[PDB]
């Protein structure tokens, strides 16, 4: 394409949700702060705005990325594919731990597309690149893919990965957690990556860590010298209530 | 070789204490949280404690909390389990169990190695 894009356009008054979501943050994280709203907004426009919406770099985010920078203790972070709501849902009631989407810069751009167009100056509402049939150097892949390498590079101790057990590949190679994510965990800082591989919670009593592709994980994290380790959760109805509550004699059962 | 092996057991009166090791090999004992489970003779398999590979976590079942302390030993690949004021009711063969993962994050799941077990007997 050129200025007809197949992806949905500039998620509508983007400007105006990324200013408001970057305030809400700033003022509830205080060790934060020294952050200007308006400032990281600059910073965000400029990656893209006036831009080739097919040509965008790593270094275009480099002003949002300094601007945006947030040391999250290492040993809590949590990554995950494809299971969204309840990677979410456990850092609200585990809040020592932190997903991508709960520091500054993935809490801006999450659930939000934008593009710009070569010279026109203005951000385009009506179509922006597909990563698959359009391009792959696109506002929002680029983004994703700069924040996502330095997030996983910075994981430290145990890191925790949550995957979704009903999808056709557990663990999917072409994921930007198995693409990005697991070949940026630094076995220097990474003693044991933990998968909890989530159960569609109807009836699948097989033990999941033995599927063919979380085989495939085991083998990449084994080759980068760090334990993998790997767990079922059967029940995510009970599975927050669990972490919370692991002397319920309901829980412990489940050995 | 990955081997648990539980110690310590014997018959003891009520009131008194008794600590039971279990040594690991053949596994990097350091990177796993480590169970004691029990199970009286005749009933059904009771779940005991839990102790992450750092030791930050140690959870425990109602019936042993404020009695009983887990405790590891990563140097010398060792949990223990130490029991004060033992009850009658706490007669049982006492099994250590590897956890799949580090249970920093308390996730129960079916733990792959079991020892043989240490029978503890509580009698007047």
């Known amino acids: 394409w050129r200025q007809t894009w197949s992806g949905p356009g500039t998620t509508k008054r983007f400007p105006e949700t990324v200013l408001a979501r970057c305030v809400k943050y700033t003022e509830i994280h205080p060790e934060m702060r020294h952050v200007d709203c308006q400032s990281v907004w600059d910073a965000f426009k400029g990656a893209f705005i006036s831009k080739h919406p097919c040509d965008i770099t790593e270094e275009d985010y480099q002003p949002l990325m300094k601007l945006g920078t947030q040391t999250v203790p290492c040993n809590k972070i949590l990554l995950w594919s494809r299971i969204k709501d309840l990677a979410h849902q456990f850092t609200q009631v585990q809040r020592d731990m932190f997903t991508l989407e709960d520091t500054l810069l993935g809490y801006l751009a999450d659930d939000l597309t934008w593009c710009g167009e070569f010279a026109t100056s203005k951000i385009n509402y009506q179509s922006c690149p597909d990563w698959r049939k359009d391009c792959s150097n696109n506002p929002v892949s680029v983004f994703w893919k700069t924040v996502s390498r330095r997030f996983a590079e910075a994981a430290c101790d145990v890191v925790h990965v949550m995957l979704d057990g009903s999808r056709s590949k557990i663990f999917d190679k072409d994921s930007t957690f198995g693409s990005v994510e697991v070949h940026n965990l630094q076995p220097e800082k990474v003693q044991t990556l933990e998968a909890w591989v989530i159960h569609g919670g109807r009836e699948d009593s097989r033990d999941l860590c033995q599927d063919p592709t979380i085989k495939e994980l085991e083998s990449i994290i084994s080759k980068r010298n760090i334990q993998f380790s790997c767990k079922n959760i059967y029940r995510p109805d009970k599975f927050l209530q669990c972490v919370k509550n692991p002397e319920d004699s309901s829980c412990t059962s489940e050995i | 070789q990955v081997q648990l092996v539980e110690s310590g057991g014997g018959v003891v009166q009520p009131g008194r204490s008794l600590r039971l090791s279990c040594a690991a090999s053949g596994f990097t004992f350091s990177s796993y949280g480590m169970h004691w489970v029990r199970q009286a003779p005749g009933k059904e398999r009771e779940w005991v404690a839990v102790?992450?590979?750092?030791?930050?976590?140690?959870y425990y079942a109602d019936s042993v909390k404020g009695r009983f302390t887990i405790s590891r030993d990563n140097s010398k690949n060792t949990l223990y389990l130490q029991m004060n004021s033992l009850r009658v009711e706490d007669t049982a063969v006492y099994y250590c169990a590897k956890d799949r993962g580090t249970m920093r994050v308390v996730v129960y799941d079916t733990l792959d190695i079991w020892g043989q077990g240490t029978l503890v007997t509580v009698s007047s």
């Open positions: 102790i992450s590979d750092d030791g930050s976590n140690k």
